[PDB]
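Replying to the earlier thread about multi-chain prediction with a worked example.

Input:
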Amino acid sequence: VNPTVFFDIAVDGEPLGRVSFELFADKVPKTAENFRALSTGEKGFGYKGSCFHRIIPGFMCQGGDFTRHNGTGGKSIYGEKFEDENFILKHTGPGILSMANAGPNTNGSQFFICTAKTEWLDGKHVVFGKVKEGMNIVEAMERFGSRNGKTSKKITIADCGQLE
Amino acid sequence: VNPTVFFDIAVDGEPLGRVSFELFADKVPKTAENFRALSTGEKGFGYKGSCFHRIIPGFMCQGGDFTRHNGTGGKSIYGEKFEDENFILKHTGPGILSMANAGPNTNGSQFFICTAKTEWLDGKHVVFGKVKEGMNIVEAMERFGSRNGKTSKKITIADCGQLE
Amino acid sequence: AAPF
Amino acid sequence: AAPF
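Result:
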């Protein structure tokens, strides 16, 4: 019933590990379909070969800008941006997958994986999934980031797709 | 030349200790004066008897609402709320005394003291001072806050004034 | 309200 | 840009 997608992560081309995500399509369906479809690449464009452009140790890893590769772009499968579906789920801990945005109703394709409890984000970013397998791969990724987000090595989504 | 003001802190009436601040009047003269004037009580209203209402350990201690005491009040010495003077100074570390607000140019009386380096706030809050002595008191205060900021005990500015 |  |  709820889709599961994976990401095979790479640090400058060396394979690092697989993170897999359960998308809560039963509560945030339109948000979950957009991450699912961008992971499969079935609509022609997507995450494969994009990188995490902003990694802040102890906060979150952000990625998903496949058009401009630096947080200023990305687009959804419904157009460039769409509404905040709802705020049922909250940022309760590491592994929560939440939507990045540029204020309300500006969701595109950028997402962030929390590596800590970030309750201040509640009510401001739609949560739509959580890490299933691979959280120590997300944790190891932190080491390649910095206080301001700049990463030291290129961290890419080498491959991604749907598992179930 | 740069004013030095102080706060004697008390946890539910039990005196903890004194913190003293250097206010960078040479770079932010209008913001520094607001805080000095409110520390002495010379205009008839100010900080003595007010509390720190939001303490988030490893982030900051926030206080200065002496009208509504919950974080929805405060008033400056110029008539409720003034403009962001400038952003010369950055939130470089523990110790930074900075201005809380509700967006640009809403400075009243609420301030926060950083217990961490909070570079994400630069350009959004005016920095105007630093703990000159008593930084371990500011750390001891963190013991009574939470992830969301609620304190467990009543933390008050028992007395305040100007030293130099 | 801020800092966030 | 967000989360902040």
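Chain D touches chain B at residues 4 (CB under 8 Å).

Feel free to reuse this layout for your own posts.
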